[PDB]
Design an enzyme around this catalytic site. Structure first.
Site, PDB file in Angstrom:
ATOM      1  N   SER A  83       0.840  -1.188   0.000  1.00 29.29           N
ATOM      2  CA  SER A  83       0.000   0.000   0.000  1.00 29.29           C
ATOM      3  C   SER A  83       0.883   1.248   0.000  1.00 29.29           C
ATOM      4  O   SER A  83       1.895   1.294   0.707  1.00 29.29           O
ATOM      5  CB  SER A  83      -0.934  -0.004   1.213  1.00 29.29           C
ATOM      6  OG  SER A  83      -2.086   0.772   0.957  1.00 29.29           O
ATOM      7  N   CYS A  85       2.589   4.975   0.474  1.00 33.06           N
ATOM      8  CA  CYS A  85       2.715   5.986   1.511  1.00 33.06           C
ATOM      9  C   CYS A  85       2.110   7.305   1.036  1.00 33.06           C
ATOM     10  O   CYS A  85       1.589   7.420  -0.076  1.00 33.06           O
ATOM     11  CB  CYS A  85       4.181   6.171   1.881  1.00 33.06           C
ATOM     12  SG  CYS A  85       5.103   7.091   0.630  1.00 33.06           S
ATOM     13  N   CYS A  88       3.929   8.543  -2.247  1.00 33.87           N
ATOM     14  CA  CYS A  88       3.567   7.828  -3.464  1.00 33.87           C
ATOM     15  C   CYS A  88       2.099   8.031  -3.812  1.00 33.87           C
ATOM     16  O   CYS A  88       1.748   8.077  -4.996  1.00 33.87           O
ATOM     17  CB  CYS A  88       3.910   6.349  -3.320  1.00 33.87           C
ATOM     18  SG  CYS A  88       5.655   6.075  -2.968  1.00 33.87           S
TER      19      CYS A  88
END
Ligand SMILES: [Zn+2]
Ligand SMILES: [Zn+2]
Lengths: 152, 150
Positions: A83, A85, A88
């Site tokens: 997943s 951050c 990103c």
């Protein structure tokens, strides 16, 4: 689900495993054009390989695509084994990448996952066990290195 | 804060240096809040390196090298222009508490408000030198500008 999701996550896991082999963090990804399934780029976390503070799997993937026109991003899917951050997530938002497919959000999850949906992007969590297993192994065996990547 | 003048002077330096190299005039630096030491500086490398991700903030953070997470928690990030969602996310992820923005006139994104939403202090100084150099690039090379932010 798009017909290239299996291809995208396979390549993203390949990048995470390759990165693990090199001694870094096992987070990989790629960018796939949704129309024909072309791979625009791929990469993995380069924190230990290059001493990089910014080269997460998603940023590395996007850098390895080179400068693309905005229209290209608009019909792509970004695949990532973990997943994303907040950084990103911001990259995905900034480039206008409509779809984000996540291997797993068990070993890590940030507020970016829901913020992506808030900003109009589709997020798919596949709950891939290969991703979970390789990421859990790294965390368990190099925990201090793990907290550096998320800036704890 | 006592380092704000120094930090904006360095960020402007980087932006003007990058302008002379043919790139986008967006620069920044990271300053430790206690003693005012420069932890790193940099500018946008889009044209210098054909880079998709190396915005001024991202470049600046790259040039600090890997740091322990706690180091970021008492720093200020200086940038000549209001940050995009990506650079905003970098500031959020690293826990950098303070962001000093040179100007948000030539560009302003949802990231300025989102930064405050997430508990970070954002200060816009409305620096005229930054506005001038950024306006010049936009007026000389609007196609490069729009290809980037449009
Ligand atoms: Zn990230
Ligand atoms: Zn940016």
């Amino acid at each position: 689900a798009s017909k290239w999701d299996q291809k995208g996550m396979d390549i993203a896991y390949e990048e995470a495993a390759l990165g693990y082999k090199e001694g870094g963090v096992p987070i990989g990804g790629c960018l796939i054009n949704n129309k024909d399934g072309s791979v625009l780029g791929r990469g993995h976390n380069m924190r230990f390989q290059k001493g990089s503070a910014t080269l997460h799997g998603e940023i590395s993937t996007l850098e390895n695509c080179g400068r693309l026109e905005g229209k290209v991003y608009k019909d792509t899917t970004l695949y990532t084994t973990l997943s994303p951050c907040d950084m990103c997530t911001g990259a995905i938002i900034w480039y206008g990448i409509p779809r984000c497919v996540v291997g797993e959000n068990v070993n890590f999850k940030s507020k970016g996952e829901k913020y992506l949906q808030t900003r109009g992007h589709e997020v798919v969590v596949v709950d891939d066990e290969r991703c979970k297993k390789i990421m859990k192994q790294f965390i368990d065996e190099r925990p201090q290195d793990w907290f550096e990547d998320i800036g704890e």
